[PDB]
Scaffold this motif. Structure first.
Motif, PDB file in Angstrom:
ATOM      1  N   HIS A   1      10.008  28.863 -71.347  1.00  0.00           N
ATOM      2  CA  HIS A   1       9.518  29.251 -70.030  1.00  0.00           C
ATOM      3  C   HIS A   1       8.363  30.235 -70.194  1.00  0.00           C
TER       4      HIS A   1
ATOM      5  N   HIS B   1       5.282  32.456 -68.305  1.00  0.00           N
ATOM      6  CA  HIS B   1       4.941  32.977 -66.994  1.00  0.00           C
ATOM      7  C   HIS B   1       4.229  34.318 -67.125  1.00  0.00           C
TER       8      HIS B   1
ATOM      9  N   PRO C   1       2.894  37.272 -63.966  1.00  0.00           N
ATOM     10  CA  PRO C   1       2.489  37.592 -62.590  1.00  0.00           C
ATOM     11  C   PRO C   1       0.975  37.805 -62.520  1.00  0.00           C
TER      12      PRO C   1
ATOM     13  N   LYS D   1       5.717  47.525 -82.883  1.00  0.00           N
ATOM     14  CA  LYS D   1       5.959  46.090 -82.957  1.00  0.00           C
ATOM     15  C   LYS D   1       5.537  45.549 -84.323  1.00  0.00           C
TER      16      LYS D   1
ATOM     17  N   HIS E   1       6.848  32.610 -58.812  1.00  0.00           N
ATOM     18  CA  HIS E   1       8.057  33.028 -59.517  1.00  0.00           C
ATOM     19  C   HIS E   1       8.915  33.964 -58.648  1.00  0.00           C
TER      20      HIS E   1
ATOM     21  N   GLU F   1      14.284  33.076 -63.053  1.00  0.00           N
ATOM     22  CA  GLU F   1      15.460  33.862 -63.392  1.00  0.00           C
ATOM     23  C   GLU F   1      16.753  33.012 -63.388  1.00  0.00           C
TER      24      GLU F   1
ATOM     25  N   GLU G   1       7.350  33.344 -74.658  1.00  0.00           N
ATOM     26  CA  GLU G   1       6.259  34.123 -75.242  1.00  0.00           C
ATOM     27  C   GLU G   1       6.623  35.567 -75.550  1.00  0.00           C
ATOM     28  N   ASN G   2       7.832  36.020 -75.199  1.00  0.00           N
ATOM     29  CA  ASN G   2       8.116  37.451 -75.218  1.00  0.00           C
ATOM     30  C   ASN G   2       8.876  37.929 -76.452  1.00  0.00           C
TER      31      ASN G   2
ATOM     32  N   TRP H   1      20.287  34.567 -64.405  1.00  0.00           N
ATOM     33  CA  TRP H   1      20.748  34.658 -65.781  1.00  0.00           C
ATOM     34  C   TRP H   1      20.923  36.088 -66.252  1.00  0.00           C
TER      35      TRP H   1
ATOM     36  N   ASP I   1       8.525  39.719 -60.572  1.00  0.00           N
ATOM     37  CA  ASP I   1       8.100  40.742 -61.520  1.00  0.00           C
ATOM     38  C   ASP I   1       7.952  42.114 -60.865  1.00  0.00           C
TER      39      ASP I   1
ATOM     40  N   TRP J   1      11.292  43.720 -60.588  1.00  0.00           N
ATOM     41  CA  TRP J   1      11.888  43.946 -61.900  1.00  0.00           C
ATOM     42  C   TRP J   1      11.480  45.306 -62.476  1.00  0.00           C
TER      43      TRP J   1
ATOM     44  N   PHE K   1       3.222  50.636 -68.181  1.00  0.00           N
ATOM     45  CA  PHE K   1       2.184  50.450 -67.159  1.00  0.00           C
ATOM     46  C   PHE K   1       2.771  50.168 -65.782  1.00  0.00           C
TER      47      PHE K   1
ATOM     48  N   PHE L   1       1.480  47.792 -62.185  1.00  0.00           N
ATOM     49  CA  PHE L   1       2.260  46.849 -61.381  1.00  0.00           C
ATOM     50  C   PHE L   1       2.429  47.344 -59.954  1.00  0.00           C
TER      51      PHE L   1
HETATM   52  O1  LIG Z   1       3.842  45.967 -69.100  1.00  0.00           O
HETATM   53  C1  LIG Z   1       5.129  45.423 -68.842  1.00  0.00           C
HETATM   54  C2  LIG Z   1       5.256  44.123 -69.643  1.00  0.00           C
HETATM   55  O2  LIG Z   1       4.318  43.197 -69.118  1.00  0.00           O
HETATM   56  C3  LIG Z   1       4.248  41.932 -69.747  1.00  0.00           C
HETATM   57  O3  LIG Z   1       5.490  41.218 -69.588  1.00  0.00           O
HETATM   58  C4  LIG Z   1       5.326  40.045 -68.825  1.00  0.00           C
HETATM   59  C5  LIG Z   1       5.885  38.899 -69.681  1.00  0.00           C
HETATM   60  O4  LIG Z   1       5.072  38.687 -70.843  1.00  0.00           O
HETATM   61  C6  LIG Z   1       5.966  37.630 -68.842  1.00  0.00           C
HETATM   62  O5  LIG Z   1       6.582  36.581 -69.565  1.00  0.00           O
HETATM   63  C7  LIG Z   1       6.769  37.893 -67.556  1.00  0.00           C
HETATM   64  O6  LIG Z   1       8.087  38.197 -67.909  1.00  0.00           O
HETATM   65  C8  LIG Z   1       9.052  37.767 -67.022  1.00  0.00           C
HETATM   66  C9  LIG Z   1       9.621  36.410 -67.528  1.00  0.00           C
HETATM   67  O7  LIG Z   1       8.725  35.347 -67.305  1.00  0.00           O
HETATM   68  C10 LIG Z   1      10.914  36.134 -66.770  1.00  0.00           C
HETATM   69  O8  LIG Z   1      11.560  34.888 -67.090  1.00  0.00           O
HETATM   70  C11 LIG Z   1      11.887  37.323 -66.818  1.00  0.00           C
HETATM   71  O9  LIG Z   1      12.428  37.416 -68.086  1.00  0.00           O
HETATM   72  O10 LIG Z   1      11.338  38.522 -66.457  1.00  0.00           O
HETATM   73  C12 LIG Z   1      10.117  38.909 -66.957  1.00  0.00           C
HETATM   74  C13 LIG Z   1       9.642  40.065 -66.048  1.00  0.00           C
HETATM   75  O11 LIG Z   1       9.584  39.833 -64.683  1.00  0.00           O
HETATM   76  O12 LIG Z   1       6.204  38.961 -66.812  1.00  0.00           O
HETATM   77  C14 LIG Z   1       6.104  40.190 -67.517  1.00  0.00           C
HETATM   78  C15 LIG Z   1       5.409  41.141 -66.545  1.00  0.00           C
HETATM   79  O13 LIG Z   1       6.154  41.122 -65.347  1.00  0.00           O
HETATM   80  C16 LIG Z   1       3.955  42.143 -71.237  1.00  0.00           C
HETATM   81  O14 LIG Z   1       3.832  40.900 -71.895  1.00  0.00           O
HETATM   82  C17 LIG Z   1       5.056  43.007 -71.856  1.00  0.00           C
HETATM   83  O15 LIG Z   1       4.843  43.208 -73.229  1.00  0.00           O
HETATM   84  C18 LIG Z   1       5.054  44.354 -71.138  1.00  0.00           C
HETATM   85  O16 LIG Z   1       6.056  45.201 -71.668  1.00  0.00           O
END
Ligand SMILES: OC[C@H]1O[C@H](O[C@H]2[C@H](O)[C@@H](O)[C@@H](O[C@H]3[C@H](O)[C@@H](O)[C@@H](O)O[C@@H]3CO)O[C@@H]2CO)[C@H](O)[C@@H](O)[C@@H]1O
Length: 476
Positions: free
Chosen positions: A10, A12, A14, A104, A197, A255, A353-354, A407, A447, A450, A459, A463
């Motif tokens: 997945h 994504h 914002p 990291k 989302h 989610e 991607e996270n 989830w 987001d 969250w 940051f 947001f």
């Molecule tokens: O600075 C805060 C944070 O921002 C960025 O995170 C983003 C994620 O990379 C991105 O995937 C998305 O994350 C959401 C997922 O898609 C979702 O399924 C669920 O797990 O919640 C997440 C949060 O809502 O959005 C966030 C930003 O909202 C950045 O990449 C991080 O390193 C950074 O810490």
């Protein structure tokens, strides 16, 4: 007898684009595009397995803007400039960004340690700081192509930095094309989510939070978000149509959030299959295996992801050696395979991607070993979403009702129920009364809620600025 394995990654972000200035106030879309959004499907060039992907429409919008050269990214501008041209504020942003990412594994460059140990940085030292921030997010494809520059680790010139930037934008420009190609070649299915989302079950019926958390306090939902919930789904179908030429038949509910009303909406909108989380299944039926295909009221197909396997990759294996992690995962699959007479369907669904930035070498040793191993296991068949949806030699069951949740622990507490998150809903509710344009849909993304009222939140002031800007723009 086979075990059917289904990866669903997945993807994504914002919307970081401030609506009044058009500036991208955070670089996370850029950095996850060059590190993950091309390279994750690009594994399918090297490994003969099936891998599936979800792309949210708001993420697609931003990838398009970067690829067209229209994204005004403020952090990236501080990277691109000759250091003699940097503003004091831009140097401070660079150092701040380095500090946040410093621990990291992808930032494991000796030279970063030296630079963050200096009282002040000269032009040569800032060139290294800029270029190493870029290179820290180098994806798998360019880690081989730019290997010589990566091993340099120090002493970067402006020309070398610009060369890396040009290669990164090339990767971004090829990203939507690689998704069309793996889709057309049958190497994977591509899904989408409702446009920005949002939490569809709350937009349809805020009281669904009391299905799991009776003690939570929520604000007065004095306006209806039901039509917006429909719009998120409809506009998502149109955006997916524009990229891929067809309407989506699979969706990832943001989610993993579902409810009886949300499932009906996806059905009314022509969606044929989604997935959600194992905890929802356990909350909804007394005895239920997640290795079956489920039919909600004979209207829509539902798979429940295997939460353990999904969380091992998403949260655990970064702390493991790569070979041991793959051995553990294959061993769990073997146990599942041996535990049932029928052919189980095992969904592994998580953010795509996270987690990788916390693995050694950006998860590349882990994923190359995992995929290389899976492709030679004769008793495992990886499946596209389309193959999982139509596979005949599988067990199935009808379900009539689900208990609303996500989830995250099966409930909605990460997005509503404390003072700070509730304040955001009240802001959205009052703004929805006067909304004039679809920027109200942007502010409905999950987001924003969250990050509110949380301890970490890197940051979070940005947001907050974005959320409130979209809320103000929606009323004009
Ligand atoms: O600075 C805060 C944070 O921002 C960025 O995170 C983003 C994620 O990379 C991105 O995937 C998305 O994350 C959401 C997922 O898609 C979702 O399924 C669920 O797990 O919640 C997440 C949060 O809502 O959005 C966030 C930003 O909202 C950045 O990449 C991080 O390193 C950074 O810490």
């Amino acid at each position: 007898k086979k075990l059917f394995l289904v990866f669903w990654w997945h993807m994504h972000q914002p919307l970081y684009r401030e609506p009044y200035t058009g500036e991208y106030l955070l670089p996370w879309t850029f950095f996850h595009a060059v590190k993950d959004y091309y390279d994750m499907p690009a594994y399918l060039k090297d490994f003969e397995i099936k891998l599936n992907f979800n792309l949210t429409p708001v993420l697609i919008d931003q990838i398009q803007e970067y690829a067209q050269g229209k994204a005004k990214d403020v952090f990236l501008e501080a990277i691109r400039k000759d250091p003699d041209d940097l503003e004091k504020e831009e140097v401070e942003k660079l150092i701040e960004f380095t500090k946040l990412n410093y621990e990291k594994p992808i930032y494991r460059f000796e030279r970063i340690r030296e630079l963050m140990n200096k009282e002040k940085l000269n032009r040569e030292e800032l060139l290294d700081l800029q270029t190493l921030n870029l290179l820290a997010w180098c994806g798998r494809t360019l880690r081989k192509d730019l290997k010589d520059l990566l091993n340099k680790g120090r002493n970067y010139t402006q020309e070398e930095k610009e060369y890396v930037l040009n290669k990164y934008f090339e990767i971004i420009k090829k990203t939507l094309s690689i998704y069309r190609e793996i889709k057309e070649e049958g190497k994977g299915s591509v899904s989408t989510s409702p446009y920005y989302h949002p939490l569809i079950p709350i937009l349809l019926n805020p009281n669904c939070v009391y299905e799991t958390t009776p003690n939570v306090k929520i604000p007065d939902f004095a306006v209806s978000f039901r039509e917006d919930a429909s719009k998120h789904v409809e506009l998502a179908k149109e955006k997916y149509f524009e990229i891929f030429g067809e309407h989506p038949v699979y969706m990832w509910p943001p989610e993993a959030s579902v409810s009886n009303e949300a499932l009906e909406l996806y059905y009314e909108k022509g969606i044929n299959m989604l997935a959600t989380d194992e905890v929802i299944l356990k909350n909804s039926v007394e005895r239920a295996s997640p290795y079956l295909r489920y039919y909600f009221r004979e209207l829509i197909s539902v798979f429940f992801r295997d939460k353990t396997l999904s969380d091992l990759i998403g949260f655990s294996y970064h702390a493991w050696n790569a070979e041991d992690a793959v051995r553990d995962f294959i061993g769990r699959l073997k146990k599942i395979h041996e535990s049932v007479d029928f052919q189980p369907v095992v969904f592994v669904v998580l953010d795509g991607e996270n987690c990788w930035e916390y693995y050694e070498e950006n998860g590349i040793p882990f994923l190359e070993k995992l995929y290389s191993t899976l492709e030679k296991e004769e008793w495992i068949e990886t499946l596209t979403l389309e193959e999982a949806m139509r596979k005949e030699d599988v067990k199935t069951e009808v379900i009539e009702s689900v208990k609303a949740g996500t989830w995250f622990d099966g409930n909605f507490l990460k997005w509503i129920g404390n003072k700070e998150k509730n304040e955001y809903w009240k802001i959205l509710i009052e703004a929805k009364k006067k909304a004039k344009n679809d920027y109200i849909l942007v502010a409905e993304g999950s987001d924003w809620f969250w990050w509110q009222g949380e301890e970490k939140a890197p940051f979070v002031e940005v947001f907050d600025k974005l959320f409130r800007s979209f809320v103000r723009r929606a009323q004009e």
